[PDB]
Design a protein around this ligand. Sequence first.
Ligand SMILES: *[C@@H](C[N+](=O)[O-])[C@H](C[C@@H]1CCNC1=O)NC(=O)[C@H](CC(C)C)NC(=O)c1cc2c(OC)cccc2[nH]1
Ligand SMILES: *[C@@H](C[N+](=O)[O-])[C@H](C[C@H]1CCNC1=O)NC(=O)[C@H](CC(C)C)NC(=O)c1cc2c(OC)cccc2[nH]1
Lengths: 305, 301
Amino acid sequence: SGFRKMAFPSGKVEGCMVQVTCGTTTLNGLWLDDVVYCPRHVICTSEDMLNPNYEDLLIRKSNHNFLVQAGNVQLRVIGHSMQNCVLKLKVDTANPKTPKYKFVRIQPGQTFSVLACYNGSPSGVYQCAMRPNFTIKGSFLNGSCGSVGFNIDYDCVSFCYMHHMELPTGVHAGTDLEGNFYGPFVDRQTAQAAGTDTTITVNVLAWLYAAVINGDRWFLNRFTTTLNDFNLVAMKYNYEPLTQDHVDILGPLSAQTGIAVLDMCASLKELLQNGMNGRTILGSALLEDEFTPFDVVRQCSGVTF
Amino acid sequence: SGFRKMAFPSGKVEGCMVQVTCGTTTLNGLWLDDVVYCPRHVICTSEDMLNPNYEDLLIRKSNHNFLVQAGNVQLRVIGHSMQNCVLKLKVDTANPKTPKYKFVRIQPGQTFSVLACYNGSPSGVYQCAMRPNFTIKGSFLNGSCGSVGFNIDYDCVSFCYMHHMELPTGVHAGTDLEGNFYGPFVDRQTAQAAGTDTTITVNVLAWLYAAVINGDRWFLNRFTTTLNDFNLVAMKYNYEPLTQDHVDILGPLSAQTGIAVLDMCASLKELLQNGMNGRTILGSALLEDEFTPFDVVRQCS
Ligand SMILES: *[C@@H](C[N+](=O)[O-])[C@H](C[C@@H]1CCNC1=O)NC(=O)[C@H](CC(C)C)NC(=O)c1cc2c(OC)cccc2[nH]1
Ligand SMILES: *[C@@H](C[N+](=O)[O-])[C@H](C[C@H]1CCNC1=O)NC(=O)[C@H](CC(C)C)NC(=O)c1cc2c(OC)cccc2[nH]1
């Protein structure tokens, strides 16, 4: 027992991290088979970044302007293309450490592990959630661009995030592995403002189910509710409404505790419309919203990869 | 910018995790060169664990009683010994993935990454601190024993922890890689209580510095205090004393933020006296003590 923020083990992603340099600009890339994926702004100088034209800057670049390195070992670039905000660089060597993988585009509320990297080189791993306003409350310094976020689905790595920028509020924004931004953000040296953020309701429920599993269940009331009524009340508290997928993924925790999704919702509706008194849940007066239902089962059940 | 509980990348340790079976008990071992390290209680039955005499249990075993598994491949055990609570299994194959490594014993207040494993397979990685009462607040189920804790410096893995026990309070106990327990615990099947746990003051200060670096200044004041006066109040609330060494190690965070360590001590004393009045610091409702000054420097410079 115990309940921690746990990242997936990072080894399969570590064997895929490379350095990509165009002139003086160095950032991180992901080497899967004979392609390296990285942020397209590697082709910019400091001054270009202000308001770049990426088609115009790329047309002037050839394979031989790109330095890809695995540690201090050069991989020759034999092709390049831009796909949205990502650059794909074909290289002469198939990565012998390529895991089984997919490119996934995640929903707000979903968590993933970030492998923070500097000059190709993994530095740290932590667990994040995609916020409802399409930011992540990450930890990133200069040189971190192209660090990836991922889930592991047994032997399969699912890549969901590539890091591109820090908003003025110190939160972070990036793309899926096809170079489409999460949220309305653009890759430009421009101060961009995120939407007002909300609490991830499905994740708070998952945490409530985790408490109940650990025999802390004082907050169970005798009520139920409709999904719609709950969704209308939850939006008044700055809480994300629930989808049919949200109800479905709470299924296993519902089955294991014997508590219907809509009874737990009615319990959480009373928590918002009342507060905690000064009482605690899993030792906390703050409701945690960065554990998914899968995060609660994976960790309470010891799932491996 | 931003601040997160961050673990070391796990890859160099994942390459060393193996499954160890003796009779009906399976747990994790650490395969470095031609040795597999694992908890010794794997030689025990549901009888033995109640009051095991491990010298006796071990002399009654041979190599063939130990089934080591690295992926799909069984490893041949060509010898065995015991160093305190850790079993050493000599095998006929050296681990090609053996990183540069040391065995260190860490001090209370120091942090490390844990790679939680089940049946020799990695499940999860998280950051922990050795509590002053030599417990850790981990996340560990049945099968987790032999999971290791570690720091990485350059290409050197410093192993500092192997997992053995859950206490009734739901915290965790285990050994260094020489098989000496952190704290007054024993690898027996019994309820064991720990000493009263103190808060790691130097770590709470580092985290307040992290908070200020991330633009979070509400708890600051224009009071100051002596070190002794701060320590009188800290000790009253079951916080560890702050030493001059601790003050010195906060230096770089004081210099970065332009807040003198004793001015941050004055902030912490007000927080201990008044509480946080429903407010949060870096998204926490409680004073966090599992980040070292170095953890803060590493992430905030
Ligand atoms: C990666 C770039 N690289 O390594 O090549 C960084 C990661 C940032 C830096 C600090 N913390 C992080 O997460 N990306 C950037 O610096 C990014 C580059 C653009 C995509 C071209 N810019 C920003 O993240 C940025 C720019 C501004 C700004 O413009 C003057 C004002 C306010 C905030 C801001 N953030
Ligand atoms: C690992 C064993 N393995 O083969 O994997 C176990 C660690 C898990 C258990 C669930 N949570 C964890 O961290 N270790 C044990 O189960 C350990 C075995 C002895 C050292 C031989 N025992 C305990 O952790 C234990 C026993 C106990 C007790 O005895 C009657 C009463 C209250 C709490 C207890 N915890």
